[PDB]
Protein: Trehalulose synthase
Amino acid sequence: PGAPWWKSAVFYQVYPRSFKDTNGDGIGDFKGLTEKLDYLKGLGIDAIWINPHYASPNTDNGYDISDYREVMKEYGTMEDFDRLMAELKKRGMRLMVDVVINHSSDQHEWFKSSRASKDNPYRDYYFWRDGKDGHEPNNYPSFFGGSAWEKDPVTGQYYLHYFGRQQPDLNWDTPKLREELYAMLRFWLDKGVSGMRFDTVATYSKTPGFPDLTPEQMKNFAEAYTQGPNLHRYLQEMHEKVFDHYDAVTAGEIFGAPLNQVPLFIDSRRKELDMAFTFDLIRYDRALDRWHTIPRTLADFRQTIDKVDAIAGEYGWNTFFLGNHDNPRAVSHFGDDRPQWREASAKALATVTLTQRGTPFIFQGDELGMTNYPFKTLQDFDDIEVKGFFQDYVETGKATAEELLTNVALTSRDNARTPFQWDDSANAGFTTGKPWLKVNPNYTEINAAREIGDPKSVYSFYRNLISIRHETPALSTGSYRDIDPSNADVYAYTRSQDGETYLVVVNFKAEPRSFTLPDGMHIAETLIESSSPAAPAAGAASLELQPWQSGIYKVK
Ligand SMILES: [Ca+2]
Structure:
């Protein structure tokens, strides 16, 4: 039997708002993305996942949808969307769209109807509840600041919003609402979309009665929000009424759930989702408050990967990524972005990304080695999440504005949202106008035009790794074995399939290091290396590594 196309595909994530502007308003759009499909095809990309592209007031840049069947005005028209799909198809590429159905915008007609009175047909499309003891229904906090309950004087009741106040949570306990969501998914699937990524998929089911979270639960309320008693029943119902009738791949952003529960979402036999986006690795060094960083080592990094790979088991499947639109830049976060180590470490991280067991997702700009942005003031951030941290921590006196800036500069989602750096023209060729978010001044040294023309660039390395992965089945669907989970200097593992075994060795130190192959194992051939002055000799039982050197070898 063969493995589904998605298990061996290499995905690229495009945050439209920041990819390519073609009309000078400072915001990326569909025409811009369509104009760059040859660029993506040339890198070797099989499929693209685009962030929300629907009608939205943009309080959470696309994640607050006011009409699920209309395109976002800033990105273009439905015609532009249809052309994007037609052009991807001409190139044999597939599209994965973002599905945001844990909540809608408060400007969605369902909510405008719902909030108008206590007795209308849409009242239960959301959660409305009486306050208690003079305040909110319970102690639930919002990820974006303050309480997760907002009072509406029209009826005197509060509505639930785990995220922004303008993102009321949809009520999955209402069958008519579930059916409306299913019809909506069919609208897009009928257009030919090849994949759907389910935004905060683990929070759909709410706890009956809304009791207060205990003091312990309050510490990590994100986890309690993924413990709704009807979650899997709803996901299985969605698969039965929708996905069982199409051949689209589904992936879930499983935010907040304990890793041990992940199999329930992805075991193929359960007929729920196909792939998992987990946060254990990308948030492995993030404090519970989400804006401070905790020092970790490569031992923590690889041990987390080992735990995540183990939960996919036999019937599950993981996506793998080191960056996305909600986290700091890969090279800054996991590598060393200083001028002298940025390219070397970005290449090392590329080797890791493209040799993990699972479907890799490359975030726009990481193939160039883009870095975090040098924020100078709190006003340099656009993200509603930072305004939420200001509300919860600075206005409350828990931290100073200076402390928030210092710390959130290293963790903010905005680090990943600065405009893609195409070349060294005005605003790195992203726009002819004024970018919605400032372009990183390092675009003069980090830009696609320059990378493409240099065989020694980060871009060229990614391109070469993608080709290698495409020609080596073991590198996608092969088994995974960490040679030494306790080693905090050099990351080494094997990928094996049908008697073929490959060894990946990556030095995470900016100093020379040595690596001794497992007893009986010997280098047979060197497929590729980064930052190496010479490949090992056939038969070698050890390797000498330069700072940040990475390599993939066929062993015997
Ligand atoms: Ca535009």
Summary: The chain is about 25% helix and 15% strand.
